[PDB]
Structure formats: C-alpha cells, structure tokens
Amino acid sequence: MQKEYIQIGNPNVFNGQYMLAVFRLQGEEGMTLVDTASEVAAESSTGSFVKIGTATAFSESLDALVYRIDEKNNLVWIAYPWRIFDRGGNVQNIMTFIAGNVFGMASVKVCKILDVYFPPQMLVQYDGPEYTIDDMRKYLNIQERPIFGSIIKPKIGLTSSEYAELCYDFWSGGGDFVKNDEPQADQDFCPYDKMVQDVRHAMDRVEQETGKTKVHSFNISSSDYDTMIKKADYIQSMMKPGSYAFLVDGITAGWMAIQTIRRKYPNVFLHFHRAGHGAFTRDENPIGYTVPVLTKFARLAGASGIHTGTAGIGKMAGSPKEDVMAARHALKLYSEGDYFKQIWSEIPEKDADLQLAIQKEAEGEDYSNLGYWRITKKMCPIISGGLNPLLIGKFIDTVGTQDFITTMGAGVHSHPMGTKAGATAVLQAYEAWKQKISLEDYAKDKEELRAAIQFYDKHEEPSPDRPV
Amino acid sequence: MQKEYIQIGNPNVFNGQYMLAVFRLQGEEGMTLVDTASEVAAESSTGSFVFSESLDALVYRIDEKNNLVWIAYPWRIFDRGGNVQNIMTFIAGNVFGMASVKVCKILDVYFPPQMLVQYDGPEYTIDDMRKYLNIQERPIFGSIIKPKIGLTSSEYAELCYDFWSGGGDFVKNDEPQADQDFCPYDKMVQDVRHAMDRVEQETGKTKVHSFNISSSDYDTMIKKADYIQSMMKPGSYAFLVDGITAGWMAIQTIRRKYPNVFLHFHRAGHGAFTRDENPIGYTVPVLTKFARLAGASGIHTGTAGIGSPKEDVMAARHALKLYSEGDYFKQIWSEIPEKDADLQLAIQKEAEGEDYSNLGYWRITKKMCPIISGGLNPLLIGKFIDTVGTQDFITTMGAGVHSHPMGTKAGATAVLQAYEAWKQKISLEDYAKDKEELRAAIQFYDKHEEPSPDRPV
Numbered sequence: 003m004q005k006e007y008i009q010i011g012n013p014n015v016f017n018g019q020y021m022l023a024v025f026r027l028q029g030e031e032g033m034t035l036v037d038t039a040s041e042v043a044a045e046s047s048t049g050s051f052v053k054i055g056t057a058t059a060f061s062e063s064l065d066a067l068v069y070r071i072d073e074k075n076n077l078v079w080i081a082y083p084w085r086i087f088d089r090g091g092n093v094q095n096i097m098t099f100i101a102g103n104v105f106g107m108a109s110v111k112v113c114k115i116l117d118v119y120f121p122p123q124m125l126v127q128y129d130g131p132e133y134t135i136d137d138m139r140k141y142l143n144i145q146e147r148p149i150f151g152s153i154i155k156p157k158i159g160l161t162s163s164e165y166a167e168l169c170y171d172f173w174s175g176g177g178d179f180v181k182n183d184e185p186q187a188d189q190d191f192c193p194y195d196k197m198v199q200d201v202r203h204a205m206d207r208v209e210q211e212t213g214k215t216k217v218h219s220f221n222i223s224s225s226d227y228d229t230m231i232k233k234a235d236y237i238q239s240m241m242k243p244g245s246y247a248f249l250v251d252g253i254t255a256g257w258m259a260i261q262t263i264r265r266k267y268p269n270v271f272l273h274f275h276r277a278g279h280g281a282f283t284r285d286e287n288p289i290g291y292t293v294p295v296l297t298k299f300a301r302l303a304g305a306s307g308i309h310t311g312t313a314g315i316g317k318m319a320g321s322p323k324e325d326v327m328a329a330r331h332a333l334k335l336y337s338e339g340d341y342f343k344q345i346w347s348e349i350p351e352k353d354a355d356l357q358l359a360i361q362k363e364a365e366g367e368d369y370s371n372l373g374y375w376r377i378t379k380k381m382c383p384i385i386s387g388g389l390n391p392l393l394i395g396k397f398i399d400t401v402g403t404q405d406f407i408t409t410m411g412a413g414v415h416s417h418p419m420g421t422k423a424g425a426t427a428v429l430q431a432y433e434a435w436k437q438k439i440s441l442e443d444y445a446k447d448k449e450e451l452r453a454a455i456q457f458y459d460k461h462e463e464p465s466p467d468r469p470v
Numbered sequence: 471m472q473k474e475y476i477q478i479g480n481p482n483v484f485n486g487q488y489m490l491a492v493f494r495l496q497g498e499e500g501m502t503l504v505d506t507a508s509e510v511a512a513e514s515s516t517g518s519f520v521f522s523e524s525l526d527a528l529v530y531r532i533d534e535k536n537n538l539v540w541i542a543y544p545w546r547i548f549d550r551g552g553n554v555q556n557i558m559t560f561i562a563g564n565v566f567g568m569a570s571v572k573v574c575k576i577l578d579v580y581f582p583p584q585m586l587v588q589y590d591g592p593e594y595t596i597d598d599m600r601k602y603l604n605i606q607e608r609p610i611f612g613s614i615i616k617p618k619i620g621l622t623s624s625e626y627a628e629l630c631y632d633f634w635s636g637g638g639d640f641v642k643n644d645e646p647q648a649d650q651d652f653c654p655y656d657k658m659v660q661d662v663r664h665a666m667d668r669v670e671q672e673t674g675k676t677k678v679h680s681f682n683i684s685s686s687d688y689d690t691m692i693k694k695a696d697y698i699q700s701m702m703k704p705g706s707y708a709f710l711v712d713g714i715t716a717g718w719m720a721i722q723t724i725r726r727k728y729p730n731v732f733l734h735f736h737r738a739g740h741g742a743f744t745r746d747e748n749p750i751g752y753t754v755p756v757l758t759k760f761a762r763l764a765g766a767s768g769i770h771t772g773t774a775g776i777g778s779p780k781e782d783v784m785a786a787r788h789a790l791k792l793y794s795e796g797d798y799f800k801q802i803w804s805e806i807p808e809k810d811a812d813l814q815l816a817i818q819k820e821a822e823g824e825d826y827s828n829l830g831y832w833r834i835t836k837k838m839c840p841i842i843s844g845g846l847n848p849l850l851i852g853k854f855i856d857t858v859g860t861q862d863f864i865t866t867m868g869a870g871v872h873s874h875p876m877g878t879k880a881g882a883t884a885v886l887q888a889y890e891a892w893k894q895k896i897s898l899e900d901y902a903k904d905k906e907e908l909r910a911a912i913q914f915y916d917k918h919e920e921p922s923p924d925r926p927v
C-alpha cells in the first residue's frame with residue numbers, strides 16, 4: 003500500500019482529464035478502507051508509485067487518485083487519467099484497468115463499480131452509437147411508437163423453416179422485429195445458412211402481403227472473428243439494407259466483438275445481448291459492476307441497443323429504478339447514475355445550445371439538432387420479460403419513453419388465437435393507450451385484443467418469459 | 471416451470487451425448503429447488519418444452535441439503551465450429567440474470583470424448599516454448615515489469631533486458647499495456663526486440679516476450695499480431711489476450727489465426743465470475759477447463775497458498791493433465807473411448823509420475839500451463855514446485871525479482887539459483903554459500919516489507 007494514490011480533495015479530478023468511478027469497497031479484516039482503496043487505485047492504473055522517471059513530463063502523473071471517501075457507507079471515489087487507457091477508443095482496455103485484477107484480489111472482499119463518469123474530452127475518443135432506433139423506425143416507416151418485437155419459442159430446437167414461419171406469423175400480425183435467441187447459431191438442426199435464407203423468404207412473403215417492412219436481428223456471435231464476419235457478409239448478401247440487425251453476445255463473445263461490428267458495419271443496428279452480465283451486475287455479487295455502468299460502457303462502445311427488464315411491470319414486485327436508469331443512460335443527452343451526472347456530448351457544459359437542447363429534451367424533443375458529430379448518439383433499451391397487450395400501456399407510462407424495442411415471447415405466442423393475432427393484440431393495445439381509450443372499450447371492436455384481455459388476466463403461463 | 475426438464479435418475483446422461491454440469495443453485499426465498507432447477511435447465515437450453523431425439527437440458531440429480539443440481543446438456547445444442555463463447559452463453563448467460571435464482575454458481579463441467587472432438591484444444595504448449603528457449607524440464611521463469619504502466623518504451627525494454635540478462639526466460643506486458651501515447655505500441659515492440667537482441671548477443675540464449683494484443687477491434691489486434699511477427703523472431707514472442715474483457719472470441723481467433731504462437735490467456739476480470747464471495751458465476755476450475763477447450767496455451771493461476779492450495783492445484787491439473795479430477799467430475803482429456811487399454815495405461819503412467827508414450831498426438835487434448843501470479847521469490851519457488859506437483863508452469867514475478875537488493879538482473883539469477891538448489895536437493899543456505907545473488911535473496915525476502923507487493927491475477 004502506497005499513500006501516494008490517496009489524494010483526498012484533489013481539485014483537479016474535475017478538470018476533464020479524468021474518468022471518475024465510485025466503488026463500493028471493503029478490505030479483508032484488518033485492512034482500512036483507505037488502504038484498500040490505495041491498492042485498488044494502484045492495480046487499476048500504474049501498479050506502483052514511482053517518483054522519479056517514467057514517461058510523464060515532470061509536471062504530469064498517470065496514477066489513479068482516491069479523491070473522496072465515505073467510510074460509513076464503504077464508498078470510494080477514484081479518478082483515472084484517461085490518457086492511461088489504450089488509444090483507438092478501446093473499451094475492453096478500460097474494463098481491463100478498472101474491472102480486471104481488482105476483482106481477483108482476495109484482500110478486497112467487496113469491490114463493486116457503482117457509477118462512472120466520462121468527461122466531454124474523453125467522449126471525443128470513443129465511437130458512441132451510429133445506427134439508432136431512429137434509423138430503424140425510418141426503415142420500418144413508423145414514427146413515435148415503440149418497436150414491437152418477439153423472441154421465438156421454443157428458443158432452440160426449431161428447424162430453419164419452423165423458425166422462419168413463426169417469424170412470418172409475428173410480422174404478419176403487425177409485429178416489427180424478431181431476434182434470434184442469444185445462442186442461436188449454426189446448430190445442425192437449424193443450420194445458419196438455411197436459417198438466414200428461410201428468414202428472408204418469410205420476410206418477402208410478409209412484405210408482399212402487408213406492404214410493410216420488417217426487421218430480423220441475427221446472432222452473429224461465433225467461434226472466431228473470421229466466422230462472425232463471414233456471417234455478417236452473408237446476411238448482407240441475403241437481406242435488404244435495414245431489414246437485419248446484428249446481435250452480438252457482448253459479455254461472452256466480448257467487448258472487442260461489439261466494437262468490431264460497430265466499426266465494420268456502422269450502418270447496421272448493433273444489438274448488444276447482455277447474457278452473462280449478471281455475474282458482474284447482480285446485487286447478490288459484492289464483486290463486479292452494476293447494470294447502469296454496463297449500459298454506459300455499451301453506449302460508449304457504440305451498441306445501438308442493449309437489453310433491460312420491464313421496469314417492474316408484469317414482474318411480481320420488482321423495482322423500476324434500475325431499468326429506467328439504464329434506459330435514460332442509453333437514450334438521453336442528460337442522464338444520471340447514483341453518483342454522477344452525465345452529459346452525452348463533447349460540447350462543454352456551459353454552451354448555450356447544449357443547455358437549450360437539455361431543456362428541450364426535458365420537454366420531449368430530440369437533440370439531434372446539436373449535430374450528430376457533437377453528441378453521443380442514442381442507444382435504446384430492448385425489453386425482456388413478461389409484457390403482454392394488457393401491460394404495454396402501463397410500461398410506456400412507467401419507463402417514460404416510447405424509444406424501446408420489446409422482445410415478447412409468451413405475451414404474443416400464448417395468445418389463444420395464435421402468434422399473428424398476438425402481435426395484432428399488442429398493436430391494438432398500443433393504439434388504445436395512444437388514443438386514451440380503455441382496453442375493454444377498444445376491444446369491443448377488435449377480437450384479438452378482446453381475446454388478450456380474457457386470456458392474459460388469468461392464464462398461468464407454463465413457461466413464462468425470463469429476464470435478459 | 472415445466473417438469474419435462476426434471477429427469478432425476480435418467481441413466482442416459484452418461485451415454486456420451488451430454489455435457490454435464492454441477493451448479494450450486496438456490497431459488498429466491500419461496501421457490502423450491504426443483505422448480506429453480508427446471509427453470510435454469512430450460513433457460514440454458516431449449517427455453518420451453520414442446521422423433522427419438524431431444525435437445526432439452528435434463529436435471530438428473532438434486533442434493534437439497536447442499537443446494538447442488540446436476541444438469542445434462544445435449545452438446546448437439548451448442549454451435550458448430552467449436553464455438554466456446556456459445557457454450558458459455560447457454561450455461562453462463564441469462565441464468566445469471568434471473569432474479570428468481572439467488573445462488574447460481576457452476577462448480578464443475580464434464581466434456582465427454584465425442585464433444586472434445588469438436589473443439590480445438592491447445593496447439594502451442596509450454597513444451598514448445600521450452601524447445602525455443604533450449605531448456606528441459608524446469609519451469610519457465612518470468613517477470614512483470616514495474617511500474618506496470620508508465621515507463622517509456624526504452625525504459626520498459628531495458629528492464630526486460632536486465633531480467634533476461636540475469637537468466638530470466640520470459641517477460642509479459644501488463645494486461646492493459648497497449649498503444650498509450652507515452653509508450654506507443656510500435657516503439658514498445660521495436661525496443662523489446664533491440665533489448666532481446668542484446669541479450670542474445672551477450673549470453674547466447676533465446677528469450678520470450680508476451681505482448682498484449684488486446685485491442686479496440688479485431689483489425690487492430692491482427693495488425694498488432696502481424697507487426698510483432700514481422701519484428702520478432704519466431705518463438706521469441708507470445709500473444710497475451712485479455713480473455714475475459716476482450717472476450718472468448720479473441721482467444722479462439724488468435725488460437726486459429728496464429729496456431730504456432732503461445733496463446734497467453736490473461737484472465738483479468740474473472741473474479742466477478744469466479745470469486746467465492748459471488749454466489750452467481752462459475753469457478754476457477756470451470757474457467758480453466760473452458761480455457762483449455764478454447765485452446766489457450768497458458769492461463770493465470772495463483773501461488774497455491776505459497777490460503778488453501780486446492781484451487782490452484784486443481785486448475786493446474788485441469789490445464790496440464792491427460793486425466794484431471796474436479797470436485798464432481800473426472801475428466802479424461804481425450805476423444806479415445808474410456809475403455810481403451812492404451813488410454814487407461816497412459817492415465818496410470820501419468821498418475822505414477824511416469825512418462826507415457828503409448829498414445830498418438832491427434833486424439834488427446836494438448837496441455838495448457840498455469841502462469842503463476844503472486845508473491846513468489848527465491849525463498850519460495852522450491853516450496854511452490856513441491857506444492858503444485860509439476861514443473862510445467864511459467865512464473866510472472868514482480869517484487870520477487872525487481873526488489874532484489876542487487877537489482878533486477880541479480881534477482882533473476884537468484885531465482886535460477888534457487889531452482890538449482892531445489893533440483894540438486896541442496897538447502898538454500900548451503901547452495902548460497904557460493905552464490906551471492908541467492909545469498910542476498912535468502913537474507914532479504916524473509917523480512918522485507920514490500921512497498922508495492924505483487925497482486926493476484
């Protein structure tokens with residue numbers, strides 16, 4: 003333990019040269035919080051303090067600094083000179099410093115990153131998203147409303163033709179979007195080449211019959227990069243521009259896979275499937291980093307969408323706080339964590355145009371007028387869990403935005419009239435919400451929604467939708 | 471929940487078509503273990519249940535008292551192409567995000583022989599690195615550089631020079647050492663080569679440097695790898711990949727694109743999955759088994775308590791051996807059927823500490839070695855060898871060489887001298903009567919309070 007990593011009250015940490023982080027931290031018995039914090043700061047930056055030498059100018063330092071402590075609540079604030087991070091906008095490298103070996107120190111019994119802050123100067127160095135929910139709405143030729151999507155059930159085991167036919171049914175009923183299961187890939191019983199081909203053919207039929215475009219999100223997570231690229235290129239050759247998204251298992255395949263697809267296919271929606279995140283993010287795990295932190299780094303890395311839950315809706319009990327925090331970190335110009343306020347722009351905070359855009363955001367207006375080259379573009383939540391037509395209105399009112407993509411399973415496929423009618427019932431429920439008509443009244447005219455009222459009030463689902 | 475996923479006592483799970491797993495599993499308060507097990511089996515396989523075959527994961531044993539659940543995965547459900555990230559997405563994915571499951575820790579996994587056929591395993595091993603170094607039998611003695619981030623390229627390379635000049639074999643980049651402006655990647659590679667050239671010229675010995683190629687994206691990682699290949703002589707470099715943060719795909723990509731380069735799996739970040747304090751995740755032995763399956767040449771462990779040695783010893787066995795034992799499953803690292811007499815003889819020979827030569831290269835999973843992180847030094851290396859029961863490891867010492875009172879070069883010499891004492895069955899004190907580097911070390915490392923001690927990986 004070297005005391006030089008402890009600089010309580012250091013004014014300079016807010017000067018824009020530092021990424022900030024809050025850790026919940028607790029050392030093993032006999033180690034003080036400040037001693038523990040020094041070791042965490044050291045191992046997440048320069049390792050050892052060196053007074054003479056190193057590459058810094060005489061006036062410069064690369065050490066992380068503990069600048070605030072709350073012993074009562076086992077909290078420490080650490081400032082990272084972001085110059086220490088790899089260039090080229092490398093997000094896996096940041097996570098390797100702050101969320102790497104520190105999680106392996108047996109002397110640190112609690113080590114949870116609760117929040118991080120990116121100064122405007124740092125945001126310049128990272129991609130942020132490029133293709134957004136606004137671009138997907140444009141391809142779908144819809145405005146304002148959420149994008150209503152589906153997972154297929156059973157999630158693994160259908161043949162390519164069976165899988166595509168349920169996509170056809172959902173899209174045919176007015177559904178917008180279908181995702182592969184997060185580990186749906188090149189299983190021999192549903193081979194990847196045929197899966198893509200059969201999805202295209204199913205989508206062609208819906209387009210011919212309804213006149214409407216649709217989107218399918220393909221899992222391209224693979225053994226290796228060459229295979230993932232071969233899948234992405236194959237999909238681009240098999241599907242019309244806009245009609246496909248790329249699903250990457252960001253936690254298991256890796257941060258590098260997210261950034262690779264963001265950069266090689268910038269005009270394709272990049273769907274960050276966060277399967278596996280719970281080991282980092284769950285409340286029960288004292289070592290890791292929280293869902294809001296994950297979401298912030300996913301936006302920095304350039305994901306177009308990342309999953310959340312249903313903000314407590316449908317889920318018995320369940321707090322909305324975390325999902326709404328994540329949705330706002332994903333979507334807004336101004337968002338807040340538990341410890342840091344975040345403006346998602348390289349424009350300095352004092353700028354009059356920026357502050358006006360922040361105020362207009364509070365009034366419900368998009369902030370693209372600032373220039374996409376001066377902001378971090380929006381990433382959207384992808385909603386996993388037990389929504390159904392009876393709950394979509396309450397969910398919109400709870401999350402406070404329509405800028406999300408649902409991925410409903412039971413809430414469409416268990417509809418007693420079938421998946422097509424199930425998708426229709428969700429759209430009808432949305433219309434009732436928009437027009438301020440009760441479900442019951444709106445359904446007097448509409449058998450799909452009427453059937454959904456009778457069914458989803460009472461049905462005990464044998465296999466409920468699960469979290470992502 | 472669906473009962474179809476509960477098949478307690480099903481004898482077919484042992485027929486070779488299933489990957490087996492043991493979870494420490496507990497539902498949230500108010501959920502029975504059987505219901506929790508059914509939901510976890512479903513969400514890690516077919517999702518929901520709907521002519522002779524089936525892809526559903528099967529819960530085949532439950533220990534209520536100890537909150538243990540045994541699950542069989544038909545490995546046909548996994549992606550083709552030997553995709554390891556896909557396996558982890560099934561068994562270590564959304565199940566960790568199920569608030570209805572308050573404990574969910576994969577404790578062991580079992581790979582049947584015909585499953586192993588589908589995966590690469592390692593290609594370049596510690597034995598290949600020994601051949602490049604022109605050594606036999608002994609461990610490969612390596613170092614981290616300190617301060618780990620902040621030195622110029624020339625300063626970094628000069629400490630490599632000092633360590634290698636003293637007899638050290640191996641240096642690794644820090645796990646997040648990359649293209650920082652103050653130590654740019656291209657100059658780092660150039661200056662490491664210049665340093666290595668001087669050592670070769672002055673000692674006649676070859677040396678190895680492990681370069682972090684973890685990057686923002688695949689093209690950048692490949693550019694770095696190709697640059698290193700153009701700048702360093704074959705064998706003299708290894709590729710360090712931050713497997714947890716860069717991802718499983720990065721590991722497999724380097725394994726396949728550069729098969730004849732040592733693939734150094736730096737496990738920074740694994741603690742969120744593996745730590746005992748975290749009820750949700752998967753353990754170090756499980757991580758190690760999947761690292762070998764994916765084809766890492768080495769992966770980090772600790773010092774086997776040199777704390778209990780059990781975990782690090784188990785990791786070393788899963789990494790290196792033809793036959794290794796987890797807490798719940800015995801593992802033969804071969805596609806050969808278990809009844810095969812040659813296979814059983816080889817396992818017997820290995821258990822007797824004897825070399826076996828009766829198998830043939832293409833039907834076994836090659837060895838991956840531990841990379842030892844923590845506070846070893848000349849006083850402790852013999853005790854570590856004895857404790858881990860193998861010499862097939864790479865050390866990456868920091869303070870245990872760089873804090874040597876005579877300097878880094880002398881520190882590396884002292885480690886080799888300590889190894890010589892161990893090999894020759896001579897006490898450290900007796901061997902050091904003639905060896906001032908070791909003598910200084912023996913009198914220093916038993917009392918020095920290190921200002922910046924080595925930390926785990």
Ligand SMILES: [Mg+2]
Binds near residue numbers: 153183184
């Ligand atoms: Mg899924």
Ligand SMILES: [Mg+2]
Binds near residue numbers: 614644645
């Ligand atoms: Mg390190």
